[PDB]
RNA sequence: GGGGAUAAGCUCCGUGCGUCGAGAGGGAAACAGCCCAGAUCGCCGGCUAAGGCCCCUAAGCGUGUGCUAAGUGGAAAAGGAU
RNA sequence: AUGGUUUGGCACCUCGAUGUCGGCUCGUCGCAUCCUGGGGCUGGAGCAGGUCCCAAGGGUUGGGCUGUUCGCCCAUUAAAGCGGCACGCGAGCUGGGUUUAGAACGUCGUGAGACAGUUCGGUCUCUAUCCGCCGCGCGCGUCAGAAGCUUGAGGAAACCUGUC
RNA sequence: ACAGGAUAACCGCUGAAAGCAUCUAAGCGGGAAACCUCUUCCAAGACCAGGCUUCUCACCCUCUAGGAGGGAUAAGGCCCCC
């Protein structure tokens, strides 16, 4: 559970512009 | 071709920074700049040219906020369950020079050269240092205005 | 303070109390000890006294070692050890050249005797760390004594430094605590320490007043 | 604030010495020392009183004002009048007798308990089941009076133990 | 001392305060005394 | 939008939508599919994009006015709260 | 809403092989605490409890039945904790179970045969290269070459407890 | 083990913001097998490679005389031997 939430969170980074592959 | 330091081109000088009442982060970045020789215009990444930096009054150094009791300095011995931590307040009481050293050590390059730079940093807890024969030049932390 | 004197283990024996109870004592020769040097705070950084013990032919002693004895003004001794005290108020009790004897102790005073254990050589895990074994029947294939599993698998995937396995054992310094001294023999300079002190018959030991009961 | 906006009256027999943010008061009962916070400036009116002032109106100055003023009045009152805390003990076979500067309590324990008086505090026993503790520092007087109060666990059923005179302790009934 | 995510002034004498960043409720009746945690 | 529990890095569809597939270089610490941008070769020249400018780490412990006391920043819900 | 240990959903790594249940030996970690330690509130008189908060240093038994995990039972005990580590651990051990070929019963099938039905029997291979770990040496360094005796930054071990 | 230090839960003292009240914002205290010392052991390859002492503390050759190379030694050590 811990691993999944962290990956979806790091899509919010400034350089990703709110989208990332594999969500 | 751009100029690169030869055999005997490098030169050293000794700086002493009064760590009293200086912020730990601010003092460390100033020392880490000196030790790497960033101030000289003869800088070259693969050749060290930093100037020996002596830090005196290393136990009076001021740490802001609640970091005196809530910031831990961790260390692991390798054995299972071997992780032992000391809050900064305790680490200052036992041996105070460590807090200044680590906060500088983690500012320098981590490669083999950064291990050689460390040999040029002498830090003392008291207000006196034995290196008076080398005539350290007193150094202060200002900021060039733009 | 922490009285101490360098001694030699002689052997074990058996003596009887006034209440007719039997006590198994170890005979320790606490031979005369010569104070060769005193370590002070301003000189060395700790407060300790350096004793010497044993008789050695002066031809045998090596020249660097011989000079240390001559400078202190004493005859060379086989073993030189050092007792660590804890203050300058205790160092003042000692002076170079003063001789210590078995009389410093009294009957009924708890002491801690330190020595090098007996040698046991390459010892298996059934002997070293007191493992169990595996059954000698019901099918055990050639595993009657070997340890067994070492760790997990693939997590951690290493052996976790600190695990207990085979290797050399014994022959290491060890200290026994709160050993009563049954009798202080005056003529022969021998302590009758009730209990079993570590070492091998004729091995050097250090007997000091107990930390806990002292 | 309202507390901080009230000048501190100094009776004629009391001496007040001010050194910036450091304050010391000398009087008949003894000498006390105090230090005030950075935001507040402490000065002396020529009438012979104490006045405290706060420069701005944020939390720090407003909160520190009331404290800093009422800290001095306790300081001045300690060196003219002093503080005496009166206690009394309830229970059967509960005794108090004074030994030197120390105080002993017989609270029903298998052993008797002894309390040592620190510097600046004195114990004066009046009756076996009633005594008093007197000193200069209001905090130190109240502090030791707290420790004495913790000697016996609260007893809602019979009320055995130490008490303050005006204290009213809740009591329930142990029936079944 | 009840420890709940929700603390309320059960009775009229109950007072809601804050000590060391944690909300409490202090009342003369010890039953009402609770703390947010 | 359907199926699912309006779950899945699920599955099935539409899109003169994109990229990877078949794509190097800069950014996201590392990280095919996200953001900037399509590599003809050389240069010890210059200006920029996304992203940054205390030290590692290149360039700001930048200027003005405020806010935060929680290391919030540097994970989260019903709800509680002078 | 947390957790990811249960029954599942998906089919993304491995079918030119990732050995699968129990037991043994060996551990190590979390705290959502069984005992021991500290507290609040009690419809807490005392003894004994109930509930909640802090706390992971140590400890946590021997047997009957079953392949059993689990469970019931017999004696104690201060307690007989819950879970992760490929439902830890088979290049460490057993093979009782399951899941090859033999055989029989019940049931299905006209028949070869079949049964997450039952019963008896049924090969557990390998000289450790590298990381790892337990031990022991050879070389060099510490600004001349050697010998004693040491401070110790940094680690490791231990920490249980009852009755009178 | 005994003892000491800083603490968790919890109990407090002095106290304003907020004429009262509040363990809290400034201060001061108590407080557990947990943490740091205390007990035992390893430990200067701790590259900041440590300290107190003691002994030897001096002889030749070569290239070219700058440094290096070669030999014989002292204190000491090792090998062979019991
Ligand atoms: C005596 C000498 C034999 O040792 C055995 O009997 C071991 C004990 C078998 O285990 C027997 C015994 C047993 C119980 O397994 C231990 C049983 O499971 C099966 C029948 O294998 C082996 C290793 C089998 O492997 C196993 O094959 C399985 C299909 C997969 C399994 N694992 C990788 C997935 C793997 O170990 C396999 C295929 O025969 C290996 C092949 C190459 C051989 O024929 C080799 C040359 C054999 O002559 C032999 C090794 O010399």
From Swiss-Prot, chain B:
<dbReference type="GO" id="GO:0022625">
    <property type="term" value="C:cytosolic large ribosomal subunit"/>
</dbReference>
<dbReference type="InterPro" id="IPR005823">
    <property type="entry name" value="Ribosomal_uL13_bac-type"/>
</dbReference>
<dbReference type="GO" id="GO:0017148">
    <property type="term" value="P:negative regulation of translation"/>
</dbReference>
<dbReference type="GO" id="GO:0006412">
    <property type="term" value="P:translation"/>
</dbReference>
<keyword id="KW-0689">Ribosomal protein</keyword>
<comment type="subunit">
    <text>Part of the 50S ribosomal subunit.</text>
</comment>
<dbReference type="Pfam" id="PF00572">
    <property type="entry name" value="Ribosomal_L13"/>
</dbReference>
<dbReference type="InterPro" id="IPR005822">
    <property type="entry name" value="Ribosomal_uL13"/>
</dbReference>
<keyword id="KW-0687">Ribonucleoprotein</keyword>
<protein>
    <recommendedName>
        <fullName>Large ribosomal subunit protein uL13</fullName>
    </recommendedName>
</protein>
<dbReference type="GO" id="GO:0003729">
    <property type="term" value="F:mRNA binding"/>
</dbReference>
<dbReference type="InterPro" id="IPR036899">
    <property type="entry name" value="Ribosomal_uL13_sf"/>
</dbReference>
UniProtKB/Swiss-Prot annotation, chain C:
<dbReference type="GO" id="GO:0003735">
    <property type="term" value="F:structural constituent of ribosome"/>
</dbReference>
<dbReference type="Pfam" id="PF00297">
    <property type="entry name" value="Ribosomal_L3"/>
</dbReference>
<dbReference type="GO" id="GO:0022625">
    <property type="term" value="C:cytosolic large ribosomal subunit"/>
</dbReference>
<dbReference type="InterPro" id="IPR019926">
    <property type="entry name" value="Ribosomal_uL3_CS"/>
</dbReference>
<comment type="function">
    <text>One of the primary rRNA binding proteins, it binds directly near the 3'-end of the 23S rRNA, where it nucleates assembly of the 50S subunit.</text>
</comment>
<dbReference type="GO" id="GO:0019843">
    <property type="term" value="F:rRNA binding"/>
</dbReference>
<keyword id="KW-0699">rRNA-binding</keyword>
<keyword id="KW-0687">Ribonucleoprotein</keyword>
<keyword id="KW-0689">Ribosomal protein</keyword>
<comment type="subunit">
    <text>Part of the 50S ribosomal subunit. Forms a cluster with proteins L14 and L19.</text>
</comment>
<protein>
    <recommendedName>
        <fullName>Large ribosomal subunit protein uL3</fullName>
    </recommendedName>
</protein>
<dbReference type="InterPro" id="IPR000597">
    <property type="entry name" value="Ribosomal_uL3"/>
</dbReference>
Curated annotation (Swiss-Prot), chain D:
<comment type="subunit">
    <text>Part of the 50S ribosomal subunit.</text>
</comment>
<keyword id="KW-0694">RNA-binding</keyword>
<dbReference type="GO" id="GO:0003735">
    <property type="term" value="F:structural constituent of ribosome"/>
</dbReference>
<dbReference type="InterPro" id="IPR019906">
    <property type="entry name" value="Ribosomal_uL6_bac-type"/>
</dbReference>
<dbReference type="GO" id="GO:0022625">
    <property type="term" value="C:cytosolic large ribosomal subunit"/>
</dbReference>
<comment type="function">
    <text>This protein binds to the 23S rRNA, and is important in its secondary structure. It is located near the subunit interface in the base of the L7/L12 stalk, and near the tRNA binding site of the peptidyltransferase center.</text>
</comment>
<dbReference type="GO" id="GO:0019843">
    <property type="term" value="F:rRNA binding"/>
</dbReference>
<dbReference type="InterPro" id="IPR000702">
    <property type="entry name" value="Ribosomal_uL6-like"/>
</dbReference>
<dbReference type="InterPro" id="IPR020040">
    <property type="entry name" value="Ribosomal_uL6_a/b-dom"/>
</dbReference>
<dbReference type="Pfam" id="PF00347">
    <property type="entry name" value="Ribosomal_L6"/>
</dbReference>
<dbReference type="InterPro" id="IPR002358">
    <property type="entry name" value="Ribosomal_uL6_CS"/>
</dbReference>
<dbReference type="GO" id="GO:0002181">
    <property type="term" value="P:cytoplasmic translation"/>
</dbReference>
From Swiss-Prot, chain E:
<dbReference type="GO" id="GO:0003735">
    <property type="term" value="F:structural constituent of ribosome"/>
</dbReference>
<dbReference type="GO" id="GO:0005737">
    <property type="term" value="C:cytoplasm"/>
</dbReference>
<keyword id="KW-0687">Ribonucleoprotein</keyword>
<dbReference type="GO" id="GO:0006412">
    <property type="term" value="P:translation"/>
</dbReference>
<dbReference type="InterPro" id="IPR035977">
    <property type="entry name" value="Ribosomal_bL36_sp"/>
</dbReference>
<comment type="similarity">
    <text>Belongs to the bacterial ribosomal protein bL36 family.</text>
</comment>
<dbReference type="Pfam" id="PF00444">
    <property type="entry name" value="Ribosomal_L36"/>
</dbReference>
<protein>
    <recommendedName>
        <fullName>Large ribosomal subunit protein bL36</fullName>
    </recommendedName>
</protein>
<dbReference type="GO" id="GO:0005840">
    <property type="term" value="C:ribosome"/>
</dbReference>
<dbReference type="GO" id="GO:1990904">
    <property type="term" value="C:ribonucleoprotein complex"/>
</dbReference>
<keyword id="KW-0689">Ribosomal protein</keyword>
<dbReference type="InterPro" id="IPR000473">
    <property type="entry name" value="Ribosomal_bL36"/>
</dbReference>
């Amino acid at each position: 559970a811990k691993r999944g939430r962290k990956k979806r969170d790091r899509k919010h980074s400034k350089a990703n512009h709110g989208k990332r592959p594999n969500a | 071709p751009t100029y690169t330091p030869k055999a005997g081109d490098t030169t050293r000088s000794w700086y002493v920074i009064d760590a009293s009442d200086v912020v730990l982060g601010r003092l460390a970045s100033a020392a880490a700049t000196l030790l790497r020789g960033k101030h000289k215009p003869t800088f070259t990444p693969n050749v060290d040219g930093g100037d020996f930096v002596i830090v005196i009054n290393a136990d009076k150094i001021a740490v802001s906020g609640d970091k005196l009791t809530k910031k831990f300095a961790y260390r692991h011995s390798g054995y299972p369950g071997g992780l032992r931590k000391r809050t900064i307040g305790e680490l200052l009481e036992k041996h105070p020079t460590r807090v200044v050293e680590n906060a500088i050590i983690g500012m320098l390059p981590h490669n083999k050269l950064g291990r050689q730079i460390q040999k040029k940093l002498k830090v003392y807890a008291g207000p006196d240092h034995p290196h008076a024969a080398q005539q350290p030049i007193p150094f202060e932390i200002k900021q060039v205005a733009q | 303070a922490r009285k101490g004197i360098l001694g030699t283990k002689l052997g074990m024996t058996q003596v009887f109390d006034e209440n007719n109870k039997v006590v198994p004592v170890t005979v320790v020769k606490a031979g005369p000890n010569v104070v060769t040097r005193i370590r002070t705070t301003e000189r060395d950084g700790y407060s300790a006294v350096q004793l010497a013990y044993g008789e050695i032919s002066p031809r045998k002693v090596i020249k660097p070692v011989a000079g240390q004895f001559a400078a202190a003004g004493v005859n060379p001794r086989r073993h030189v050890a050092e007792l660590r005290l804890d203050d300058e108020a205790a160092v003042a009790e000692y002076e170079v050249g003063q001789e210590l004897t078995a009389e410093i102790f009294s009957d009924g005073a708890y002491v801690d005797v330190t020595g090098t254990s007996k040698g046991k050589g390459f010892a298996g895990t059934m002997k070293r760390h007191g493992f169990r074994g595996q059954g000698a029947a019901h099918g055990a294939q050639a595993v009657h004594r070997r340890p067994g599993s070492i760790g997990g698998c693939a997590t951690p995937g290493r052996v976790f430094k600190g695990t207990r396995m085979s290797g050399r054992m014994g022959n290491d310094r060890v200290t026994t605590q709160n050993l009563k001294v049954h009798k202080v023999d005056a003529e022969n300079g021998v302590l009758l320490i009730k209990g079993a002190i570590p070492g091998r018959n004729g091995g050097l030991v250090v007997v000091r007043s107990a930390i806990k009961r002292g | 604030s309202r507390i901080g906006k009230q000048p501190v009256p100094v009776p004629s027999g009391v001496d007040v010495t001010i050194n910036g943010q450091n304050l010391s008061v000398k009087g008949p009962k003894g000498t006390l020392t105090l230090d005030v916070a950075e935001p507040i400036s402490v000065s002396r009116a020529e009438d012979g009183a104490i006045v405290v002032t706060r420069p701005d109106d944020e939390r720090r100055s407003r909160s520190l004002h009331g404290l800093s003023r009422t800290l001095i009045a306790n300081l001045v009152t300690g060196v003219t009048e002093g503080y005496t805390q009166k206690m009394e003990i309830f229970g059967v076979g509960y005794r108090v007798q004074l030994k030197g500067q120390n105080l002993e309590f017989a609270l029903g324990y298998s052993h008797p308990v002894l309390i040592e008086a620190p510097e600046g505090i004195t114990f004066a026993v009046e009756s076996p089941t009633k005594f008093s503790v007197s000193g200069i520092d209001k905090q130190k007087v109240g502090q030791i009076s707290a420790v004495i109060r913790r000697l016996r666990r609260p007893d809602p059923y019979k009320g055995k133990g130490v008490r303050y005179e005006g204290e009213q302790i809740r009591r329930k009934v142990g029936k079944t | 001392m009840k420890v709940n995510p929700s603390v309320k002034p059960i009775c009229d004498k109950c007072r809601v305060i804050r000590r060391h960043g944690r909300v409490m409720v202090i009342c003369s009746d010890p039953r009402h005394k609770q703390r947010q945690g």
